[PDB]
Amino acid sequence: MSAGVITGVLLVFLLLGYLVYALINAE
Amino acid sequence: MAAQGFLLIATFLLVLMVLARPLGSGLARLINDIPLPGTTGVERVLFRALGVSDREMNWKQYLCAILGLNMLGLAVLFFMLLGQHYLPLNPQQLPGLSWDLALNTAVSFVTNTNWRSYSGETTLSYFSQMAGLTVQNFLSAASGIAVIFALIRAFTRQSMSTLGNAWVDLLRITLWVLVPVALLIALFFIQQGALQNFLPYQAVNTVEGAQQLLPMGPVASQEAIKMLGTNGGGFFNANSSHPFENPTALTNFVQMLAIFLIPTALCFAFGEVMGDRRQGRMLLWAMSVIFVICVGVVMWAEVQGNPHLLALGTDSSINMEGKESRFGVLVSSLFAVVTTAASCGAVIAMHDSFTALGGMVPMWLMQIGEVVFGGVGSGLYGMMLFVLLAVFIAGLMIGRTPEYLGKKIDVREMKLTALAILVTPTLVLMGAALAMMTDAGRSAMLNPGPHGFSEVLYAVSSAANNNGSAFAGLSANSPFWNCLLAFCMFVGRFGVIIPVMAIAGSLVSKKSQAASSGTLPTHGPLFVGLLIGTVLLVGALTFIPALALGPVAEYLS
Amino acid sequence: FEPTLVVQALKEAVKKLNPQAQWRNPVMFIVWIGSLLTTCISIAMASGAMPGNALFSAAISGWLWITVLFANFAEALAEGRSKAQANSLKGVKKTAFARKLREPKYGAAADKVPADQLRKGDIVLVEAGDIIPCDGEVIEGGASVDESAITGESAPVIRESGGDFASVTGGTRILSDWLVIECSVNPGETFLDRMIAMVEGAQRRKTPNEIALTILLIALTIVFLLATATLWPFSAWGGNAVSVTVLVALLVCLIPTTIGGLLSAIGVAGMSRMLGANVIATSGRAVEAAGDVDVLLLDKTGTITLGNRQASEFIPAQGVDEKTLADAAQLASLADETPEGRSIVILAKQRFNLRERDVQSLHATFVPFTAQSRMSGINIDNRMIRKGSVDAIRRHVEANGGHFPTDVDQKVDQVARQGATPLVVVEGSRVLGVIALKDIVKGGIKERFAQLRKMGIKTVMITGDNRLTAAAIAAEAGVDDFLAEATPEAKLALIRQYQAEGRLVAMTGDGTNDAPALAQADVAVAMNSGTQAAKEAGNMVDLDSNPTKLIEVVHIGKQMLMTRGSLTTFSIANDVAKYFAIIPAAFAATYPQLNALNIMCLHSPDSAILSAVIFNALIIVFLIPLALKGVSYKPLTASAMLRRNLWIYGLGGLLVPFIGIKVIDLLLTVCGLV
Amino acid sequence: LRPALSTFIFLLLITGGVYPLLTTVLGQWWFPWQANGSLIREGDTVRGSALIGQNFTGNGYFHGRPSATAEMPYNPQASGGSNLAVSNPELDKLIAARVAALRAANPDASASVPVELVTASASGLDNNITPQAAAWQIPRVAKARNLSVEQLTQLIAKYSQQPLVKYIGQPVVNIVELNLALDKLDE
Ligand SMILES: CCCCCCCCO[C@@H]1O[C@H](CO)[C@@H](O)[C@H](O)[C@H]1O
Ligand SMILES: CCCCCCCCO[C@@H]1O[C@H](CO)[C@@H](O)[C@H](O)[C@H]1O
Ligand SMILES: [K+]
Helix, strand or coil, X not given: CCHHHHHXXXXXXXXXXXXXXXXXXXX | CHHHHHHHHHHHHHHHHHHHHHHHXXXXXXXXXXXXXXXXXXXXHHXXXXXXXXXXXXXXXXHHHHHHHHHHHHHHXXXXXXXXXXXXXXXXXXXXXXXXXXXXXXXXXXXXXXXXXXXXXXXXXXXXXXXXXXXXXXXXXXXXXXHHHHHHHHHHCCCCCCCCCHHHHHHHHHHHHHHHHHHHXXXXXXXXXXXXXXXXXXXXXXXXXXXXXECCCEHHHHHHHHHHCCCCCCCCCCCCCCCCCCCCHHHHXXXXXXXXXXHHHHHHHHHHHCCCCHHHHHHHHHHHHHHHHHHHHHHHHHHHCCHHHXXXXXXXXXXXXXXXXXXXXXXXXXXXXXXXXXXXCCCCCCHXXXXXXXXXXXXXXXXXXXXXXXXXXXXXXXXXXXHHHHHHHHHHHHCCCCEECCEECCHHHHHHHHHHHCHHHHHHHHHHHHHCCCHHHHCCCCCCCHHHHHHHHHHHHHHHCCCXXXXXXXXXXXXXXXXXXXXXXXXXXXXXXXXXXXHHHHHHCCCCCCCCCCCCCCCHHHHHHHHHHHHHHHHHHHHHHHHHCCHHHHHHC | CCCHHHHHHHHHHHHCCCCCCCCCCHHHHHHHHHHHHXXXXXXXXXXHCCCCCCHHHHHHHHHHHHHHHHHHHHHHHHHHHHHHHHHHHHHHHHCXXXXXXXXXXXXXCEEECCHHHCCCCCEEEECXXXXXXXXXXXXEEEXXXXXXXXXXXXXXXXXXXXXXXXXXXXXXXXXXXXXXXXXXXXXXXXXXXXXXXXXXXXXXXCCHHHHHHHHHHHHHHHHHHHHHHCHHHHHXXXXXXXXXXXXXXXXXXXXXXXXXXXXXXXXXXXXXHHHHCCEECCCHHHXXXXXXXXXXXXXXXXXXXXXXXXXXXXXCCCCCCHHHHHHHHHHHHCCCCCHHHHHHHXXXXXXXXXXXXXXXXXXXXXXXXXXXXXXXXXXXXXXXXXXXXXHHHHHHHHHHCCCCCHHHHHHHHHHHHHCXXXXXXXXXXXXXXXXXXXXCCCCCHHHHHHHHXXXXXXXXXXXXXXXXHHHHHHHHHCCCEEECCCCHHHHHHHHHHHHHCCCCEEEEEECCCCHHHHHHCCEEEEECCCHHHHHHHCCEEECCCCCCHHHHHHHHHHHHHHHHHHHHHHHHHCHHHHHXXXXXXXXXXXXXXXXXHCCCCCCCHHHHHHHHHHHHHHHHHHHHHHHHHCCCCCCCCHHHHHHHHHHHHHHHHHXXXXXXXXXXXXXXXXXXXX | CXXXXXXXXXXHHHHHHHHHHHHHHHHHHHCXXXXXXXXXXXXXXXXXXXXXXXXXXXXXXCCCCCCCCCCXXXXXXXXXXXXCCCCCHHXXXXXXXXXXXXXXXXXXXXXXXXXXXXXXXXCCCCCEEXXXXXXXXXXXXXXXXXXXXXXXXXXXXXXXXXCCCCCCCCCEEEHXXXXXXXXXXXX
């Protein structure tokens, strides 16, 4: 896997968990 | 064509409503704990013999009973497929399935999906089909109707904390709804030519020198459940096109009714339990309007068919490529919409060999969430998730608190419905993106171009939504596709039942209130369209790009 | 509200709201992340990297910061009008010293002590000229103070010891004499700090309706994150992958940046209008609940009329000067703190400049207004001055051996024809004149109840008058029904019976007299009480003590609910045109046959994405005045308003992005920028 | 946990034991021929069934749609279809190959080939063709067996079944029964 692509995949996963955590709470 | 295509839709819906109306009354009794006429004394003798005490269960207890039966189901099925060589009723000496094939197919039938990464006559024995696949076609269907029973009770019951008894429902559903009706349906199949025996494989010496080996087995019994329980798993590699499983056009019309039988009756039942039949009819009204439009598009798309046929000097451009001759183009087109809107998965005609539009509507009706007549319980509470969403946005734009059936929806209930809605679209987009980045996923395709990506998009969309339909051009017997899809099927099923039960337990503790100034009619045409727009726009904003790179590109190509 | 003075003082703070301090807003945090990498790439892309075109990504990334800047401009603009009003009252209390007496008796030795060091139980002296340092009760002395700091009215009000008028508010200014008070509130709980707590942030959580749509906005950004991030592996197989700068621009567009940057500004702007109506709420949750009310109840027991009718004219009958009328009418109305009484004190200063009165030189005893007597007055001279309605005074004038003059009766009958309830002022046993109390509402007050009637909200008046006289006031106001001779148990029966029929109830009344009723009510506004009585019950406080102020409370909460509902429908409806602008453009290099879907006939794929990003940023500025001023909705039922909200904001949300993308794209073509 | 395992084991014995045995016993009782595959036998050898579908290549026999199974055409051990799309280029070559080959084998018939005889079936074991497509190959069968065109059409219409309603399906000819009847007629 390309270095630039694998970092973009890690960015999507961190933003997904950040949004799912935000939906559960009221911030 | 247009006139016959119209009569095929009218005759199908008219006969459907005639059969589903009284069945909705019987389902209303099971929701209201009222036993069936003949099933009054036998229940008492049987429930005590089995240890079922008719006790009331809360939502946490009701959920752990359903999940307990399902986790026990795949544990038994997965080991049946590994030790298939040792169990009897095996005329051929078929060996035990591999770990990836056994895990995928075990998860498949417990999920009610019935994915087929194998060839029936080559892969499975009579015992594994009868003591493993038929047994799970009942339990997965019963588990689906059990969940919707609890949710419906959460709307009619007031200020309580119990949702009934799951073990009483799972018994009443199988013993006096699934088994007796499927027994009649399977017997009618046998008369028209279906297969039902335990004979060894028959050798045939044709009139020419060629010799062929016939596959036998108890097919007719399994055929009735997969259609009535919306399982869609065929005894053979070609499930509904096989002459042994669907011999005549008459049995095919029966098979199409069985797909829509229970999921339609659950709307008549929900309207009767709630007292106001209009609340059940609008739900039935919004589904049939989307259903009729979808069948008209695929019919027109398949009648146009492939123009290269006409350019090469054939009789017409009709796309008979992935079709059967017993059933017309309109019938194969209608069945294609029925089996994908209702999450059945029964393939009468290879959807991979459809046209650009004719194959996109089945693709789209799965991604939409199996809401339009979604087969066996799952489709009803799936729509209810959008009903709560439609009611929520309705009051949100007016400036009042949401209120469905008098009960006011709170913030905690809206977090669970939102997450439940996001379950299936998350698994398809992540699942498809994983396949389009692995060599084991892309190499499994068959056709090139945008249709090749449509093969991957259709596979994960069907697995996550539990439909089970496939293009079949994709060869998914590899351990990658077996593990990838099994994850989408497992999470796509129980990941939605769990928040639905939490929605159920949250609604019983509330008391329905009378109509105020801020209430909104959840019946009539205004809410039907608001519900249709809610289900269409959510699926659109989610899959419009992936469809543009799929069948839409093939259409404009 | 929008002066170049404040805008410049905010745009500087707007550019200061750009660092990594927006992670609490998930929509704008994604827009910030997208703007960060697109500039981080375009800088490295221009210096030395494989991509060939850098000015395009610099234009995309440029507008992405402009999108974040415009979102901060809305939040700062809403907080700019609020913090300005908070600082206007914040300086009022820090100008003060404080002299605390060693001995509670007046005349002791006092030393100057910082005002913030005053605690509960201290005894401070305040003579004329100084401002009240802290709240509490008056224990010695009597003077007229100016409570303009809390109500905005320069009209005087008396504060004397040993009575119902011993409640003084810190921050106000005394005018006439000296006052010795005992502090009763701790620092941080002063009446001025509660106004600060209502305006400043960090103490106002999200309301249920605010939490409502945020769950949908996070669910939508989850969809649009998965819908676009999976386009890269989907498109890299059919051809060359979609560039990251395009995926970011596509995601920032689809993400509801319209309301995600305007949602926090609507709440801040609404709470400011709440303070503008002299209503104090502990949190924004109460104001939102007033908009979800099906029936509001107005308690008229503690006052003459509903509070809409206020003093209009001074009319002297025979041989009385108008100056001597308002001179005594104010003295009688000083003890009448009801809206009817306050307006007479207001008209005393507007026509004759009666601002201050030396209370000690009068050697007077004030008669407060009571509902049983239906009159207030003062015993300043050896004669007693009184002021009340027509019925209650004739029983009092004839009690002093006085007769009703024929001219006075003719004047009272004439004012009754106009529709204004006439009040009379009498010195001892001789009538001085009549005071007219006409309606203040610009339009017909019956229309405000009619507008509330069109929406389905019912109005019921609560009072203790007779069944025949209560219907007269109910008919002149145009309310639905009324409850006359209401015992504190009859009020609870009306509230509980409404709740038993599934209807949210709002009620305005006195904190002491209607203590059990306000607790059972779903929404409550307290009159004639301090913040301490309502802060425990979580209710609002009406500073003007006007029963009709509940109508404005419901309207302010309604606008806060309509703007959120109208913008979500408008913002989501934009996504149809936004897909027809990016789908054929972003995939033109991978599947060129998708150019047929470009319905708007946009010039070039790079110009299509630029026009969508520019519209995704310019639509925020165009909707800032709508989000802060409020939506001017029309009175309709539930289902009828659902249709009208779909017609204006659904079609408007459909056609505006179509026209908006074209004009932005045509301007890029005419100017020849890209 | 006692009602959990008991409900599971009871339904496992009813649906996996009682339900299949009841359908099988009642099936072999009322409809024994159909339940055993509805086989067609002459003597002790199994020539086929009315639902199998056979790969007919002889010049004297009627031909069915292309099979597209795994190993050999019309293999009941595969039961598959051609999952080729319209956008697939290999399908066009397969269509042109079948159109040219059928026109060569049927020279005294119309040049327009019925779409059934050029498109594969979904199951791969299709034993059915519309009555018009069976008449399209009449001259080839008539020349190879010296039978008249009149009695050949009368033989096809005899072994043709129409659905109960016209829009439930299409009229269908039994190929295996038509070819077997053609052999007894030739003698
Ligand atoms: C994804 C996990 C969802 C958890 C949400 C559960 C919502 C349950 O809801 C609550 O359950 C309690 C009993 O358990 C009841 O007492 C409460 O009345 C009910 O509101
Ligand atoms: C790091 C340097 C990036 C420079 C990018 C600036 C992009 C400005 O873009 C221009 O802004 C004007 C408004 O100011 C608009 O009128 C023009 O239409 C627009 O092209
Ligand atoms: K299924």
